[PDB]
From a paper:
Human gamma-D crystallin (HGD) is a soluble, monomeric protein expressed in the eye lens during fetal development. The high expression levels contribute to the refractive index within the lens which focuses visible light upon the retina. However, this halts further expression of HGD. This means HGD must remain correctly folded and soluble for the entire human lifespan in order to maintain visual acuity. In order to observe structural changes in HGD, we take advantage of an arginine-to-serine point mutation, R36S, first identified in congenital cataracts (HGDm).
The room-temperature serial synchrotron crystallographic (SSX) structure of freshly prepared crystallin mutant (R36S) shows no post-translational modifications. Here, we present crystal structures of freshly prepared HGDm (fresh dataset), HGDm aged for 9 months in dark conditions (aged dataset), and similarly aged HGDm during exposure to UV (light dataset). Crystals were prepared with 20 mM dithiothreitol (DTT), a sulfur-containing reducing agent with a similar function to that which GSH is expected to perform in vivo. In our structures, the fresh HGDm crystals incurred an average diffraction-weighted dose (DWD)28 of 0.19 MGy after 20 ms X-ray exposure. Fo-Fo difference maps calculated between the first and last timepoint revealed no peaks above 3.0 r.m.s.d., confirming that X-ray-induced damage was not responsible for the absence of Cys-DTT in the fresh HGDm structure. The solvent accessibility and pKa of the three surface cysteine residues were calculated from the fresh structure using PropKa331 and PyPka32. Both methods predicted the pKa of C110 to be lower than that of C41 and C108.
Numbering used by the authors: 1 to 172
The structure:
């Protein structure tokens, strides 16, 4: 992976280049208003050490922070999301993997059309990395999901169990 982050809109300003996870961009960028992803799938973080609001970026050029649904120009850490060769996630109605369950291996732009629950209370990421979105059509707050067990919604760093869309992390 390779990403170049720019302090200013339109690929202007001081810039910094990453080819791996960086938990602290603060010494190098004071802000981030544009970015170019040469390769790989990236998660940008509002705060240092992969915390605060999260934003998914793929190969492409982003001329302003709105193009990645950024609420601000604050980007203080970033992660290169590992390649995965397959994707499978299970969502559950209730915590600790109880209640109704649905299993996806592909993207879903509207969860409520497949699984009539506004909220997901636990989920099992069997394969691959995914991005949960609060709202349908890949809008709202984003949560990166790596393989593993998520017995409650706090486990994926959300303040609520709302989920409206879900996307596989795939690098073109």
């Amino acid at each position: 992976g390779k990403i170049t982050l720019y302090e200013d809109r339109g690929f202007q300003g001081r810039h910094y280049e990453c080819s791996s996870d960086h938990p602290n961009l603060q010494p190098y960028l004071s802000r981030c208003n544009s970015a170019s992803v040469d390769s790989g799938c990236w998660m940008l973080y509002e705060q240092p050490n992969y915390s605060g609001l999260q934003y998914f970026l793929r190969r492409g050029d982003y001329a302003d922070h709105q193009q990645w649904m950024g609420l601000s120009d604050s980007v203080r850490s970033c992660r290169l999301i590992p390649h995965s060769g397959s994707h499978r996630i299970r969502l559950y109605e209730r915590e600790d993997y109880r209640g109704q369950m649905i299993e996806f291996t592909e993207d879903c732009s509207c969860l409520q059309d497949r699984f009539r629950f506004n909220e997901i209370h636990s989920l099992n990421v069997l394969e691959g990395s995914w991005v949960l979105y609060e709202l349908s059509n890949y809008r709202g707050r984003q949560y990166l999901l790596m393989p593993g067990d998520y017995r409650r919604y706090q486990d994926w760093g959300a303040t609520n169990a709302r989920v409206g869309s879900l996307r596989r992390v795939i690098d073109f």
